[PDB]
Design an enzyme around this catalytic site. Structure first.
Site, PDB file in Angstrom:
ATOM      1  N   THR D   1      -0.554   3.417   2.934  1.00  0.00           N
ATOM      2  CA  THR D   1       0.573   4.287   2.063  1.00  0.00           C
ATOM      3  C   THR D   1       0.719   5.342   2.540  1.00  0.00           C
ATOM      4  O   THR D   1       0.196   6.183   3.149  1.00  0.00           O
ATOM      5  CB  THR D   1       0.112   4.348   0.380  1.00  0.00           C
ATOM      6  N   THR D  51      -1.072   7.873  -3.779  1.00  0.00           N
ATOM      7  CA  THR D  51      -1.774   6.893  -3.029  1.00  0.00           C
ATOM      8  C   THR D  51      -3.114   6.711  -3.274  1.00  0.00           C
ATOM      9  O   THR D  51      -3.628   7.495  -3.971  1.00  0.00           O
ATOM     10  CB  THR D  51      -1.768   7.410  -1.648  1.00  0.00           C
ATOM     11  N   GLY D  52      -3.720   5.558  -3.047  1.00  0.00           N
ATOM     12  CA  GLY D  52      -4.946   5.310  -3.587  1.00  0.00           C
ATOM     13  C   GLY D  52      -5.286   3.898  -4.370  1.00  0.00           C
ATOM     14  O   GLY D  52      -4.655   2.988  -3.746  1.00  0.00           O
ATOM     15  N   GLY D  54      -4.694   0.941  -6.281  1.00  0.00           N
ATOM     16  CA  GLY D  54      -3.210   0.888  -6.951  1.00  0.00           C
ATOM     17  C   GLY D  54      -3.301   0.503  -8.277  1.00  0.00           C
ATOM     18  O   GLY D  54      -2.583   1.017  -9.363  1.00  0.00           O
TER      19      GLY D  54
END
Ligand SMILES: N[C@@H](CC(=O)O)C(=O)O
Ligand SMILES: [K+]
Ligand SMILES: [K+]
Ligand SMILES: [K+]
Ligand SMILES: [K+]
Lengths: 131, 157, 157, 131
Positions: D1, D51-52, D54
């Protein structure tokens, strides 16, 4: 679009929404109904399902917002619902149904009408189109 | 400390809808709420109730979901659905379904039987078969009532 | 009361990552931030800056997006993105992209050139061609490292 | 991402997020990145990009939350981000970057590291991975 929100005897909320989407929509168009926080949301406090103009419900994060205004503005369910229809829609037409973990039930909309029905265990029961 | 339930069939009513069509609608809404009410009296968890009630809403051709879905610009049906369980905020969603008989149940399955929250189009069709849910031809979803409304819509430009 | 900008290349970093690969990542972040910094100095609107900065992040094969994207169970690439303009809360989003060179700009185009907010898979590919964006074969987005990472991920399972 | 958030001189916020998604994801899986309110959100007062994991960001409605705790709890941009990060993640690992309409900038995460860079016309600039 069809939907259903429930709070059970255990205080547990849940929500479900299902749709065919907007008539004549472009191939592959995705609306608010399968988007968590938009067409559908449930947490500790509530359960919400939305219907109407997808594009307007998405930019409004409508379902999540019902839960948001209760958590941070500490509103009552019926207010949270109506607060959300007033201030998140900006010319977009939508509606929604919601329950809270306290056995409350609300509808709200800014369309001419919304096919809905609601009940509580103490014996409330309404089925409506207009209002 | 009591259960509650609501059920909807879409905001945006024909401003002139016949009483006839209104009665059908209310009857369907009543039948669905009843399934819900009975489930709740028997202590079914909320997450199971929402699913079973929306299946009835999907199967019946009156509203815009499942059979009776609105049509794309191509005059076919692409269906989507999502479901959420409040207590742990668990999620499942599907989009781009063309054969799955009950989209909400596939979404439940995404939530319970997949590492993901959201699977769409071909991959979701594949997951439908991996999970052995009822699938049919896309034609199954198209009602003559809907074909008419599309024709009317595509001209309206 | 003046401009600000952030860029990111994803959360969750390999602690086993070489010093050199780490500098390269930093170089990339700097270059991208710099395009943004200069753009905001020339007074371009925030909505245009987010797009151009993400285009550069998609084109460089380092991070998980555009070229250099992570791989499906099938070893191919399916990309997705979204963009939003604060003032009037305008939105565009795309999923299931297989040939589109810069997903973020297609998202931008959903916002500005479609009645919808979110278009995905085939229908989004068809939108790409209607809008005449740069499209290319899927193989273009697949890099060696990602192929190795996929093997290693399949084995952890 | 990857993502970028920006407030310009006019006080306008915007946000963008783009990804190839999660390695070895099932065909057709959709994560938080293209979901308005999860991976990306921008409004009058902010612009956010997450981000990370989902699934955590999605159930968390992360990007919308940064804005909400600002618009409803009156919190300033930096407080908001720390609030959403520490008190809205629940065991899930994610980061975000955000911008305020007042010209402020902020990053924030709970995992081992986040590739990121931010600048503020003050000549403030920094680019990191760990910390
Ligand atoms: N929510 C649906 C339409 C509806 O609610 O009837 C959509 O925008 O796709
Ligand atoms: K139906
Ligand atoms: K799941
Ligand atoms: K890239
Ligand atoms: K649009």
């Amino acid at each position: 679009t069809v939907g259903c929100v429930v709070v059970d005897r255990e205080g547990r909320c849940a929500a479900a929404t299902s749709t065919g989407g907007l008539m004549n929509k472009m191939t592959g168009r995705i609306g608010d109904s399968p988007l968590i926080g938009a067409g559908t949301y449930a947490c500790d406090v509530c359960g919400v399902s939305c219907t109407g103009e997808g594009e307007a419900i998405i930019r409004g994060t409508l379902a999540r917002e019902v839960a948001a205004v209760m958590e941070y503005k500490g509103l009552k369910l019926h207010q949270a619902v109506d607060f959300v229809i007033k201030h998140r829609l900006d010319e977009g037409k939508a509606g929604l149904i919601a329950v809270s973990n306290t056995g409350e039930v609300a509808c709200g909309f800014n369309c001419n009408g919304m096919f809905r029905a609601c009940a509580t265990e103490d014996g409330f029961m309404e089925v409506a189109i207009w209002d | 400390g009591g259960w509650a339930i609501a059920v909807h069939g879409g905001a945006g009513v024909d401003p002139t809808l016949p009483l006839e069509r209104q009665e059908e609608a209310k009857q369907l809404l009543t039948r669905c709420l009843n399934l819900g009410i009975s489930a709740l009296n028997s202590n079914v968890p909320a997450i199971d109730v929402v699913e079973l009630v929306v299946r009835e809403l999907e199967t019946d051709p009156l509203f815009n979901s499942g059979r009776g879905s609105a049509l794309t610009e191509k005059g076919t049906v692409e269906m989507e659905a999502s479901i959420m369980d409040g207590p742990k905020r668990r999620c499942g969603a599907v989009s781009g379904l063309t054969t799955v008989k009950n989209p909400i149940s596939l979404a439940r399955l995404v939530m319970d039987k997949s590492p993901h929250s959201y699977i769409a189009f071909s991959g979701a069709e594949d997951f439908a078969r991996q999970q052995g849910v009822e699938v049919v031809d896309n034609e199954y979803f198209v009602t003559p009532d809907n074909v008419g409304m599309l024709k009317l819509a595509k001209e309206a430009n």
